Curated annotation (Swiss-Prot), chain A:
Other facts: Present with 2610 molecules/cell in log phase SD medium.
GO molecular function: DNA binding
Listed GO biological process terms: chromatin remodeling; nucleosome disassembly; regulation of DNA-templated transcription; regulation of transcription by RNA polymerase II; rRNA transcription; transcription elongation by RNA polymerase II
Swiss-Prot/TrEMBL keywords: Chromatin regulator, Nucleus, Phosphoprotein, Transcription, Transcription regulation
SUBUNIT field: Component of the two forms of the RSC complex composed of at least either RSC1 or RSC2, and ARP7, ARP9, LDB7, NPL6, RSC3, RSC30, RSC4, RSC58, RSC6, RSC8, RSC9, SFH1, STH1, HTL1 and probably RTT102. The complexes interact with histone and histone variant components of centromeric chromatin.
Role description: Component of the chromatin structure-remodeling complex (RSC), which is involved in transcription regulation and nucleosome positioning. RSC is responsible for the transfer of a histone octamer from a nucleosome core particle to naked DNA. The reaction requires ATP and involves an activated RSC-nucleosome intermediate. Remodeling reaction also involves DNA translocation, DNA twist and conformational change.
Compartments it resides in: Nucleus
Residues of the full protein shown: 60 to 233 of 581
Protein name as catalogued: Chromatin structure-remodeling complex subunit RSC9
GO CC list: chromatin; RSC-type complex
Swiss-Prot record, chain B:
Entry's localization field: Nucleus
Keyword Cell cycle (UniProt): no
Included range, full protein: 57 to 254 of 557
Function (record text): Component of the chromatin structure-remodeling complex (RSC), which is involved in transcription regulation and nucleosome positioning. RSC is responsible for the transfer of a histone octamer from a nucleosome core particle to naked DNA. The reaction requires ATP and involves an activated RSC-nucleosome intermediate. Remodeling reaction also involves DNA translocation, DNA twist and conformational change.
Taxonomic lineage from the root: Eukaryota, Fungi, Dikarya, Ascomycota, Saccharomycotina
Assembly and binders: Dimerizes via the C-terminal coiled coil. Interacts directly with HTL1, NPL6, RSC6 and the N-terminus of STH1. Component of the two forms of the RSC complex composed of at least either RSC1 or RSC2, and ARP7, ARP9, LDB7, NPL6, RSC3, RSC30, RSC4, RSC58, RSC6, RSC8, RSC9, SFH1, STH1, HTL1 and probably RTT102. The complexes interact with histone and histone variant components of centromeric chromatin.
Sorted UniProt keywords: Chromatin regulator, Coiled coil, DNA-binding, Metal-binding, Nucleus, Phosphoprotein, Transcription, Transcription regulation, Zinc, Zinc-finger
GO cellular component terms attached to this protein's record: chromatin; nucleus; RSC-type complex; SWI/SNF complex
Organism of derivation: Saccharomyces cerevisiae (strain ATCC 204508 / S288c)
Protein name from the UniProt record: Chromatin structure-remodeling complex protein RSC8
Misc. remarks from the entry: Present with 3380 molecules/cell in log phase SD medium.
From Swiss-Prot, chain C:
Chain segments annotated as transmembrane: none
Localisation per UniProt entry: Nucleus
Protein name: Chromatin structure-remodeling complex subunit RSC7
Subunit structure: Interacts with ARP7, ARP9, RSC3, RSC8, RSC30 and STH1. Component of the two forms of the RSC complex composed of at least either RSC1 or RSC2, and ARP7, ARP9, LDB7, NPL6, RSC3, RSC30, RSC4, RSC58, RSC6, RSC8, RSC9, SFH1, STH1, HTL1 and probably RTT102. The complexes interact with histone and histone variant components of centromeric chromatin. Component of a fungal-specific module (HTL1-LDB7-NPL6-RSC3-RSC30) within the RSC complex.
Family: Belongs to the RSC7/SWP82 family. RSC7 subfamily.
Range within the parent protein: 316 to 435 of 435
Additional note from the record: Present with 3510 molecules/cell in log phase SD medium.
Annotated segments matching region Functional region: 1-120
Purpose of the protein: Component of the chromatin structure remodeling complex (RSC), which is involved in transcription regulation and nucleosome positioning. RSC is responsible for the transfer of a histone octamer from a nucleosome core particle to naked DNA. The reaction requires ATP and involves an activated RSC-nucleosome intermediate. Remodeling reaction also involves DNA translocation, DNA twist and conformational change.
Curated annotation (Swiss-Prot), chain D:
Source lineage: Eukaryota, Fungi, Dikarya, Ascomycota, Saccharomycotina
Assembly behavior: Interacts directly with STH1. Component of the two forms of the RSC complex composed of at least either RSC1 or RSC2, and ARP7, ARP9, LDB7, NPL6, RSC3, RSC30, RSC4, RSC58, RSC6, RSC8, RSC9, SFH1, STH1, HTL1 and probably RTT102. The complexes interact with histone and histone variant components of centromeric chromatin.
Originating organism: Saccharomyces cerevisiae (strain ATCC 204508 / S288c) (Baker's yeast)
Keywords: Cell cycle, Chromatin regulator, Nucleus, Phosphoprotein, Transcription, Transcription regulation
Additional detail: Present with 3940 molecules/cell in log phase SD medium.
BP terms from Gene Ontology: chromatin remodeling; chromatin remodeling at centromere; chromosome segregation; double-strand break repair; G2/M transition of mitotic cell cycle; nucleosome disassembly; regulation of nuclear cell cycle DNA replication; regulation of transcription by RNA polymerase II
Name of the protein in question: Chromatin structure-remodeling complex subunit SFH1
Gene of this entry: SFH1
Primary location recorded for the protein, binned into one broad class: nucleus
Length: 174, 179, 120, 264, 146
């Protein structure tokens, strides 16, 4: 009826019967570059940061922050290019949404001591926070250099909020 | 004339074609992989074969080794394909063999351990059509000709009703009135 | 004594034929392939096998709702008469500037032919 | 088509038993219908894996097999600004070890310039494959590897700068087959590597793949030896015996390779 | 005196040619002259003219090239392998392989041969046409392109 009915196949562990632990699956999916896997893994990482942040703490899992930085710096480039209609394509929208999701994940993790301690010791994240804050200041003081195009305001809105939260946390370490 | 040539060519190509018996399962994140091409993920994870540093490490050698390992695994996907067997068959330095084996094993391309009798089967968006995987013609089987001569033969065909039939490798021929 | 080169050359050719016949006898005639024991797997000369995969092809069924899959393999042999050589590898900075126009056109034709045969 | 009919994947391993058997001659660790076919790789089973059991070797793999936990290497944590990208230090390594009631004769290459893997890890992998895990065996293997590394280390890293042509006799025995060949090798041109040479020889003679490492490896050996005789000045350069017609570099020059099965 | 040796070699090569089969040189190799070099060889195969060693000389190079071409033309319906040439030529194996691959690239050695006579390694078969099955986080899904 089936070759699985051998005695040899009576001693299989329960750990591999599914194929891969979900943490490894999410890490490898982020490592691939396939957009569908990227979106799936980012949704799962966001849920974990919201409902179980101790399983993905930036200390117990090193080399987790580099991936988020890879998703976050193109967000800096986009935000600089956000003063005009520039989200015409769907790949641009996908990159923007991936950046926003990674930023929210970072903020949710920064709500913890070890994760924010790891975040402070990173020049890239602090420089990005400063860049977003200077853009917000340019919007606030009403400078003629960089004027937000209202068709994008929504995006910017969310962005600002996350940044400020991050700042709040790291405000204790400067 | 050419009709008999193409007929004998199809006969020979079908005689020396690897008939698949067991299904191969790989995790979804390993979907960028092609047996005949090299991806950026492979060049980043193995910079020594492509940075032109050594002469013993060439992209051709890497590709031949990894294709040997892939074919050996795919031909019998129930066993484990230990490193020692590969090392006895391949002629590289042991460090490179180990690195390639570990890289292929991390991405589930080989030695991906599941128990596929505990998961459902779905249908992707791409479905319900004729799929023709076009592979190059083998040499040493081309005819001996002592005008053009194009060839677009078809070697073997398989039909499936559902995706579960595709996964289980069950064709309509035997499935129709099995018991 | 003008027969030495010819005898050596003929011995070379006979050696070549002997090697070919021995290979064919061992690998393909007596048994179809050699079963290796390290991996427990057949080994057949790579020539009989195909090398790469030239993309895919897709179409539709005859009727709608006919949810079936027709998986099938196909070999493609654009211009089976002309053999392939390593001519798609020689850089332009070698054969150029010393060639006849016709030979240059022939070189370009061969290179383009190989490059296009690498396609579907 | 039922879920239950599928087979698990990548659990069994019959390798050790293939090593122990005499019908399967492994030179290491010793003490429709089917025609003259052994494996089902080219004969199509009619979409029924059960027929796979018609062949005794597949049955042996499915009956005398063990369940194996996978290797878990160090996940290839490469380095920080290391691997200075020297060409290669390719030194051969042999193993003659007498375990209790067991022999172990093996060979391989080792890149001394690559610090990615350590001899202890290789010993662990080897002993797991042979299914003979014992700390004493692994310590012996690692010590042998370290000794052979320290011996031929400095000699291998000596690039020759003057044209040398040497007549070389390669002789390699797998278990009972002896491969002997003679040729003329230049120790200055980095174009041809012994691996390509071995591949060409195996292609032309139609031997098994197992000869590709062996030959090449042995070739490496001889090269190193010659280097010693060229460092100690004990290597002359005045003549080289190649049967050339009347000047040098002519059309007789040598004999050819051969493979012979012997006894006694 | 040496002129007499040249005469002997010329007569020997003429006899070789007089006992060789007729072959079909491809068009893109028509620049080839049996008694010349043509500077395509000089560029593609350096180090035969840099006076690098006592061994690799243009004269010996030309001799080996002509010998290999005639040994092939003795029977154009068979692939000429490297082991035979290596058996009947005095030169470093590297140079023999260089010349062999060069003459092969321009279709001067193995242009029209019985393809069953070309040697190839014996690896496992080619599992490129096989059917793969992805393991999504939900269930097994048939891998198929779009």
């Amino acid at each position: 009826y089936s070759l699985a009915n051998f005695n040899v196949f009576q001693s299989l562990p329960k750990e591999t019967a599914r194929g891969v632990d979900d943490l490894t699956r999410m890490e490898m999916a982020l490592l691939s570059g396939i957009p569908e896997e990227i979106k799936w893994s980012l949704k799962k990482y966001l849920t974990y940061s919201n409902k179980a942040p101790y399983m993905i703490s930036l200390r117990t899992l090193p080399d987790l922050l580099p991936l988020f930085k890879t998703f976050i710096l193109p967000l800096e480039r986009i935000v600089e290019g956000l003063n005009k209609s520039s989200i015409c394509d769907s790949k641009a929208m996908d990159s923007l949404q991936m950046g926003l999701n990674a930023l929210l994940i970072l903020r949710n993790l920064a709500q913890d001591t070890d994760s924010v301690q790891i975040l402070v010791k990173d020049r890239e994240i602090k420089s990005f926070i400063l860049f977003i804050l200077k853009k917000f200041q340019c919007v606030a003081t009403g400078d003629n250099k960089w004027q937000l195009y209202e068709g994008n305001a929504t995006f910017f809105n969310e962005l600002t909020h996350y940044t400020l939260d991050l700042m709040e946390a790291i405000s204790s370490y400067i | 004339n050419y009709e008999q040539e193409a007929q004998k060519l199809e006969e020979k190509a079908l005689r020396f074609l690897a008939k698949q018996t067991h299904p191969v399962i790989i995790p979804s994140f390993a979907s960028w992989f092609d047996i005949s091409k090299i991806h950026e993920i492979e060049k980043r994870s193995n910079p020594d074969f492509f940075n032109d540093s050594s002469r013993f490490k060439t992209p051709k050698a890497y590709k031949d080794t990894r294709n040997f390992i892939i074919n050996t695994y795919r031909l019998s996907p129930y066993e484990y394909l230990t490193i020692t067997a590969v090392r006895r068959n391949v002629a590289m330095d042991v460090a490179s063999i180990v690195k390639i084996h570990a890289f292929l094993e991390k991405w589930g391309l080989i030695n991906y351990q599941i128990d596929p009798r505990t998961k459902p089967s779905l249908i992707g968006p791409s479905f319900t059509g004729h799929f023709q995987v076009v592979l190059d013609t083998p040499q040493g089987l081309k005819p001996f000709l002592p005008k053009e001569f194009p060839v677009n033969l078809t070697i073997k065909k398989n039909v499936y009703d559902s995706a579960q039939d595709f996964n289980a490798l069950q064709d309509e021929s035997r499935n129709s009135r099995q018991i | 004594s003008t027969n030495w080169l010819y005898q050596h050359s003929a011995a070379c050719s006979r050696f070549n034929s002997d090697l070919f016949y021995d290979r064919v006898k061992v690998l393909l005639v007596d048994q179809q392939g050699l079963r290796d024991a390290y991996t427990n797997i057949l080994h057949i000369p790579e020539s009989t096998q195909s090398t790469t995969v030239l993309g895919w092809r897709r179409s539709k069924n005859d009727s709608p709702s006919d949810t079936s899959i027709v998986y099938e393999t196909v070999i493609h042999d654009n211009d089976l008469n002309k053999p392939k050589t390593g001519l798609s590898e020689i850089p332009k900075e070698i054969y150029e500037d010393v060639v006849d126009e016709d030979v240059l056109r022939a070189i370009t034709e061969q290179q383009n032919f190989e490059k296009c045969n690498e396609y579907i | 088509s039922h879920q239950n009919q599928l087979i698990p994947q990548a659990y069994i391993s019959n390798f050790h038993n293939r090593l122990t058997n005499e019908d399967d001659g492994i030179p290491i660790f010793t003490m429709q219908d089917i025609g003259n076919a052994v494996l089902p790789d080219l004969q199509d089973q009619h979409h029924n894996p059960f027929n796979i059991l018609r062949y005794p070797k597949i049955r042996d793999t499915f009956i005398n097999g063990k369940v194996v936990s996978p290797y878990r290497l160090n996940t290839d944590q490469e380095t920080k600004a290391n691997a200075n990208s020297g060409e290669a230090i390719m030194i051969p390594i042999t193993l003659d070890i007498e375990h209790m009631g067991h022999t172990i004769k093996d060979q391989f290459l080792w890149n001394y310039n690559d610090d990615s893997i350590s001899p202890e890890e290789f010993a662990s992998i080897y002993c797991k494959d042979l299914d003979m895990t014992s700390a004493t065996l692994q310590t012996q293997i690692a010590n042998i590897i370290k000794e052979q590394l320290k011996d031929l280390e400095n000699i291998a890293a000596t690039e020759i700068m003057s044209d040398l042509h040497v007549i070389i006799n390669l002789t390699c025995n797998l278990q009972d087959r002896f491969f002997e060949d003679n040729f003329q090798w230049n120790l200055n041109d980095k174009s041809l590597t012994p691996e390509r040479f071995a591949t060409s020889i195996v292609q032309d003679l139609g031997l098994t793949r197992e000869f590709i490492p062996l030959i090449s490896q042995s070739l490496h050996e001889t090269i190193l030896k010659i280097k010693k005789d060229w460092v100690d000045g004990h290597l002359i350069q005045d003549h080289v015996p190649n049967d050339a017609a009347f000047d040098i570099d002519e059309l007789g020059s040598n004999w050819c390779p051969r493979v012979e099965i012997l006894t006694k | 005196y040496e002129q007499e040796a040249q005469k002997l070699e010329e007569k020997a090569l003429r006899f070789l040619a007089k006992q060789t089969h007729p072959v079909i040189i491809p068009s893109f190799a028509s620049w080839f002259d049996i008694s010349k070099i043509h500077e395509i060889e000089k560029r593609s195969n350096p180090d035969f003219f840099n006076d690098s060693s006592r061994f690799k000389t243009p004269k010996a190079y030309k001799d080996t090239r002509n010998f290999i071409i005639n040994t092939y033309r003795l029977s154009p319906y068979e692939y000429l392998t490297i082991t035979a040439v290596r058996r009947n030529v005095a030169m470093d194996v590297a140079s023999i392989v260089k010349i062999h691959a060069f003459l092969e690239k321009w279709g001067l050695i193995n242009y029209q041969i019985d393809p069953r006579t070309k040697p190839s390694l014996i690896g496992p078969s080619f599992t490129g046409h096989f059917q793969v099955v992805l393991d999504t986080p939900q269930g097994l899904k048939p891998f198929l392109p779009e």
